[PDB]
Design a binder for this molecule. Sequence first.
Ligand SMILES: [Mg+2]
Ligand SMILES: [Mg+2]
Ligand SMILES: [Mg+2]
Ligand SMILES: [Mg+2]
Ligand SMILES: [Mg+2]
Ligand SMILES: [Mg+2]
Ligand SMILES: [Mg+2]
Ligand SMILES: [Mg+2]
Ligand SMILES: [Mg+2]
Ligand SMILES: [Mg+2]
Ligand SMILES: [Mg+2]
Ligand SMILES: [Mg+2]
Ligand SMILES: [Mg+2]
Ligand SMILES: [Mg+2]
Ligand SMILES: [Mg+2]
Ligand SMILES: [Mg+2]
Ligand SMILES: [Mg+2]
Ligand SMILES: [Mg+2]
Ligand SMILES: [Mg+2]
Ligand SMILES: [Mg+2]
Ligand SMILES: [Mg+2]
Ligand SMILES: [Mg+2]
Ligand SMILES: [Mg+2]
Ligand SMILES: [Mg+2]
Ligand SMILES: [Mg+2]
Ligand SMILES: [Mg+2]
Ligand SMILES: [Mg+2]
Ligand SMILES: [Mg+2]
Ligand SMILES: [Mg+2]
Ligand SMILES: [Mg+2]
Ligand SMILES: [Mg+2]
Ligand SMILES: [Mg+2]
Ligand SMILES: [Mg+2]
Ligand SMILES: [Mg+2]
Ligand SMILES: [Mg+2]
Ligand SMILES: [Mg+2]
Ligand SMILES: [Mg+2]
Ligand SMILES: [Mg+2]
Ligand SMILES: [Mg+2]
Ligand SMILES: [Mg+2]
Ligand SMILES: [Mg+2]
Ligand SMILES: [Mg+2]
Ligand SMILES: [Mg+2]
Ligand SMILES: [Mg+2]
Ligand SMILES: [Mg+2]
Ligand SMILES: [Mg+2]
Ligand SMILES: [Mg+2]
Ligand SMILES: [Mg+2]
Lengths: 345, 361
Amino acid sequence: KISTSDPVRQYLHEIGQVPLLTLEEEVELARKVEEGMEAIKKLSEITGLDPDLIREVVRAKILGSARVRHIPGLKETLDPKTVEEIDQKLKSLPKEHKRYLHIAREGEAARQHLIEANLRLVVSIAKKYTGRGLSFLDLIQEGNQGLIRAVEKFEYKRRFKFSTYATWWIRQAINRAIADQARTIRIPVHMVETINKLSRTARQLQQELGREPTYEEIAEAMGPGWDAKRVEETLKIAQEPVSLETPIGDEKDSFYGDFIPDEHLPSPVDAATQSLLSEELEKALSKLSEREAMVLKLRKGLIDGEEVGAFFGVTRERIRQIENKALRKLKYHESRTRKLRDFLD
Amino acid sequence: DVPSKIGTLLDLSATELEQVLYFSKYIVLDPKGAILNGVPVEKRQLLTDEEYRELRYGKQETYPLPPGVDALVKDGEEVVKGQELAPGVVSRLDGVALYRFPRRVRVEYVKKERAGLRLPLAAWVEKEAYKPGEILAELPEPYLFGDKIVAAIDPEEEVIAEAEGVVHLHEPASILVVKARVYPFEDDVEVSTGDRVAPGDVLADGGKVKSDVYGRVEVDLVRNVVRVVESYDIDARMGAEAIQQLLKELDLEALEKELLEEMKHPSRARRAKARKRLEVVRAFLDSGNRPEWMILEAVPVLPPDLRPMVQVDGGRFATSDLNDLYRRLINRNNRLKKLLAQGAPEIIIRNEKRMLQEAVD
Ligand SMILES: [Mg+2]
Ligand SMILES: [Mg+2]
Ligand SMILES: [Mg+2]
Ligand SMILES: [Mg+2]
Ligand SMILES: [Mg+2]
Ligand SMILES: [Mg+2]
Ligand SMILES: [Mg+2]
Ligand SMILES: [Mg+2]
Ligand SMILES: [Mg+2]
Ligand SMILES: [Mg+2]
Ligand SMILES: [Mg+2]
Ligand SMILES: [Mg+2]
Ligand SMILES: [Mg+2]
Ligand SMILES: [Mg+2]
Ligand SMILES: [Mg+2]
Ligand SMILES: [Mg+2]
Ligand SMILES: [Mg+2]
Ligand SMILES: [Mg+2]
Ligand SMILES: [Mg+2]
Ligand SMILES: [Mg+2]
Ligand SMILES: [Mg+2]
Ligand SMILES: [Mg+2]
Ligand SMILES: [Mg+2]
Ligand SMILES: [Mg+2]
Ligand SMILES: [Mg+2]
Ligand SMILES: [Mg+2]
Ligand SMILES: [Mg+2]
Ligand SMILES: [Mg+2]
Ligand SMILES: [Mg+2]
Ligand SMILES: [Mg+2]
Ligand SMILES: [Mg+2]
Ligand SMILES: [Mg+2]
Ligand SMILES: [Mg+2]
Ligand SMILES: [Mg+2]
Ligand SMILES: [Mg+2]
Ligand SMILES: [Mg+2]
Ligand SMILES: [Mg+2]
Ligand SMILES: [Mg+2]
Ligand SMILES: [Mg+2]
Ligand SMILES: [Mg+2]
Ligand SMILES: [Mg+2]
Ligand SMILES: [Mg+2]
Ligand SMILES: [Mg+2]
Ligand SMILES: [Mg+2]
Ligand SMILES: [Mg+2]
Ligand SMILES: [Mg+2]
Ligand SMILES: [Mg+2]
Ligand SMILES: [Mg+2]
């Protein structure tokens, strides 16, 4: 059943059963998130385990079983035996350091009740960067990834609360997504703003002449180094890919693709040429000696188009020597039994 | 397809049980899930977010938090810490706080009338007890004639250097319907379950830990309170995941023989259903290829020159419409992976798995 509503009901439902208290619940969970960090680092300290390993072991114990680790990241961590060994050292950590294990876990979990509560924040924000060329669900989701981004950095010590914080960490994530995925051909953020500027300038210029600007206006109004070659180039990159499939002429079954020719494929006149050219060139190449003909034939025909570097031990003067004397006798008889002249291209 | 090829074989509601778990979250208990709804675990049956939520955390998440500071903060507290609150615990002060479900209570925050029996927070605030052993003298004037603070001297959720790290506010009376154990003991038959008196804690921490039929373990090092909540490894799953599983664990041969029987013997109705269900299983089971494949975990991608990127006019490029859908699938898929890594709130994973699902269509 049509998607948007189900998701909306889904996280609005859970927010409904649990928004976060303006203070108490955003502070609570924040503080737990942090002690989690402080806890996991001290855990690495005492265990010699990478903070990355401590982070994934506690996450498996709080977020999910063998199922999660095995399907998502494929099996580098053994499903049962491996993480279990890691939790064992966590237990052996006496009264002092066990504390951190028990804290890391609760911190991780805390991190989740905070991310659930603030999904309405995302959607409300995400509800405004809607017509950029991204799906609402795609938009809310990237924004969602941004809010999780915020959870990493929030310093509850600095009193300001998570709302204004998630706002930025989200709006960034969404503006990136819109620039990174909204197109069929990837353009940098600089060429995007550039296009917006160009567009906006064309708007101001559509304000008074009654002349959709010659790209003279566009260069001037935009600024410093803008010239015609530029704007023409810019708007050419702006236009989106038209469909290789689109209605054509007197709209009927005629699909645009049958119209476009093909260029690498040798159309029969080209296979025929290759045949004659190859056999005739191959006959001539045999009536020469190998050394400087194969050198220029392979140097030219085989690899990459280096007089000096073209011939083996023998220097330049035997190259040019043979290059140019075999090359001309090869031509000059090819002139007599004219096989090559009719230009095969 | 009208006949669901995966519904006819997997006897799931041919067309609606699928729709239900496929695109949204209606979990199908794949393997065992020992604890009740009222009756045994549903081997091949489907439950809702809400009842499932009521399966894992325990039956009741009631978060009644009080008004102002004195009335309800007092009725709730006197009967909150460890006082096993029965159902219909009629807390007394605004309207009537009504705690209508099961086993033990955890209240959340205090404000400043009288401070007694609460955790380590305020201790460092009024130096006397954390600084030296004063708390006793802290009771003030009748001591001349565990916690028990002054008559009424402190106000919020603060850290008292200078009163700088603070937070003035509410006080939740969150009933957590779970069973609280303070002094568990060590009996070695199966590996040591739960806790020892005070020294060793073998229970996993305040997250996921399975001890006896009850299966969640929260930990509060305040008193040695090993909060043991009660459900088990209920393999609750929804989407292609739950169907890939179900399709692997089926010996078509068995279903072929069972259906043989169902087919000729009982009256028309259900035997009729079985003959239409025996067709697909037999085809799968004849020279035909084997059925775990209906599931897609690896999407083939049609050729490149077949989905062209052409130069049309000036800058107009033109590509085969398939490339827009392919970007769809690719982006979602990747954002999926990134969202699993970064940490995963459940709604957001589903919401995406949903989007990803559609894309693959
Ligand atoms: Mg902390
Ligand atoms: Mg040390
Ligand atoms: Mg060490
Ligand atoms: Mg998973
Ligand atoms: Mg495995
Ligand atoms: Mg897989
Ligand atoms: Mg072994
Ligand atoms: Mg970040
Ligand atoms: Mg402050
Ligand atoms: Mg807000
Ligand atoms: Mg910039
Ligand atoms: Mg021009
Ligand atoms: Mg500039
Ligand atoms: Mg243009
Ligand atoms: Mg056509
Ligand atoms: Mg061609
Ligand atoms: Mg071309
Ligand atoms: Mg040749
Ligand atoms: Mg060279
Ligand atoms: Mg050389
Ligand atoms: Mg000749
Ligand atoms: Mg001659
Ligand atoms: Mg001549
Ligand atoms: Mg001739
Ligand atoms: Mg079970
Ligand atoms: Mg729990
Ligand atoms: Mg007052
Ligand atoms: Mg207590
Ligand atoms: Mg009133
Ligand atoms: Mg009630
Ligand atoms: Mg109970
Ligand atoms: Mg107080
Ligand atoms: Mg205490
Ligand atoms: Mg306190
Ligand atoms: Mg005092
Ligand atoms: Mg005295
Ligand atoms: Mg007082
Ligand atoms: Mg205040
Ligand atoms: Mg206050
Ligand atoms: Mg026991
Ligand atoms: Mg036991
Ligand atoms: Mg021990
Ligand atoms: Mg353990
Ligand atoms: Mg203990
Ligand atoms: Mg038979
Ligand atoms: Mg058969
Ligand atoms: Mg191209
Ligand atoms: Mg096509």
